[PDB]
Design an enzyme around this catalytic site. Sequence first.
Site, PDB file in Angstrom:
ATOM      1  N   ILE B  70       0.798  -1.223   0.000  1.00 46.55           N
ATOM      2  CA  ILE B  70       0.000   0.000   0.000  1.00 46.55           C
ATOM      3  C   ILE B  70       0.848   1.300   0.000  1.00 46.55           C
ATOM      4  O   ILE B  70       0.619   2.180  -0.803  1.00 46.55           O
ATOM      5  CB  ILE B  70      -1.106  -0.052   1.088  1.00 46.55           C
ATOM      6  CG1 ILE B  70      -2.240   0.932   0.737  1.00 46.55           C
ATOM      7  CG2 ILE B  70      -0.538   0.219   2.481  1.00 46.55           C
ATOM      8  CD1 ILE B  70      -2.766   0.751  -0.656  1.00 46.55           C
ATOM      9  N   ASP B  71       1.852   1.378   0.854  1.00 50.90           N
ATOM     10  CA  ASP B  71       2.729   2.531   0.958  1.00 50.90           C
ATOM     11  C   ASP B  71       4.036   2.138   1.654  1.00 50.90           C
ATOM     12  O   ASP B  71       4.215   0.971   1.971  1.00 50.90           O
ATOM     13  CB  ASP B  71       2.036   3.701   1.621  1.00 50.90           C
ATOM     14  CG  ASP B  71       1.699   3.455   3.096  1.00 50.90           C
ATOM     15  OD1 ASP B  71       1.930   2.332   3.624  1.00 50.90           O
ATOM     16  OD2 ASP B  71       1.261   4.464   3.698  1.00 50.90           O
ATOM     17  N   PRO B  72       4.957   3.077   1.857  1.00 50.75           N
ATOM     18  CA  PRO B  72       6.267   2.705   2.353  1.00 50.75           C
ATOM     19  C   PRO B  72       6.211   2.198   3.755  1.00 50.75           C
ATOM     20  O   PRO B  72       5.234   2.402   4.469  1.00 50.75           O
ATOM     21  CB  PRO B  72       7.035   4.054   2.319  1.00 50.75           C
ATOM     22  CG  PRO B  72       6.424   4.695   1.117  1.00 50.75           C
ATOM     23  CD  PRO B  72       4.952   4.471   1.419  1.00 50.75           C
TER      24      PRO B  72
END
EC number: 3.2.2.27
Lengths: 51, 221
Positions: B70-72
């Site tokens: 989804i994201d870092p």
Amino acid sequence: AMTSSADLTNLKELLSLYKSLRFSDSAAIEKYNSLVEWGTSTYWKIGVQKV
Amino acid sequence: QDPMNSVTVSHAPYTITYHDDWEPVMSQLVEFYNEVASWLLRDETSPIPDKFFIQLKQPLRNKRVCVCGIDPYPKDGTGVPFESPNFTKKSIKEIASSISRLTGVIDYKGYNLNIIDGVIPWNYYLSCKLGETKSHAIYWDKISKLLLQHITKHVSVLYCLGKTDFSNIRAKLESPVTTIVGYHPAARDRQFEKDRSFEIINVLLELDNKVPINWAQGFIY
């Protein structure tokens, strides 16, 4: 479910049937077409078609 | 600095360096980034702004799989999705033990999805405010669609990690692409351990007459 052993099992049987493509009864060809539908529907797009 | 190009934006990091394969989207990326970046830049981020875009240096034409989170990492992102240079982050450790289990490799010191032929590790949102997953969703949204659609023109299989985070991924794309949505490595009950995605990806590839992914190339010794 996409991610279980059983998904893997069906994908492997579909690949096998795709490799021979040599169907000797209604069963088999129907198994193949119905696996294509299941795969298409579960993973959105797959590389093989109904025959 | 020859298959690599760069474009100038109006906010940090100011220059985006990209491989030719990304050219068709660069124009809109610049426009999309300029309108949101100042909002974004108000917080400290994972990764730092200088690293937001370094995955655009990767070729796309040789990729057959995009592995997407989804994201870092909420902390210590490097700009390379899933990368943990000192092999410390949980997700990468868990992914590596799946691959160990799968391939029979037992002594290793590292694993990185970015050194595997045919794989592009990807973060759907390119940043988050330090410490807080999904905090920059609202800023990245149009960009995230733009970039993931471009990616999916080249790959044969999109694998997304996060049942909840990716339950609407199809809506985010135009044209169908083989899509697998598996458990996050942190999912309850060791579900990630039972998730056979890496093997399922490779059967899917053979069904699209592609070469399976050699997951052991990931290891670092």
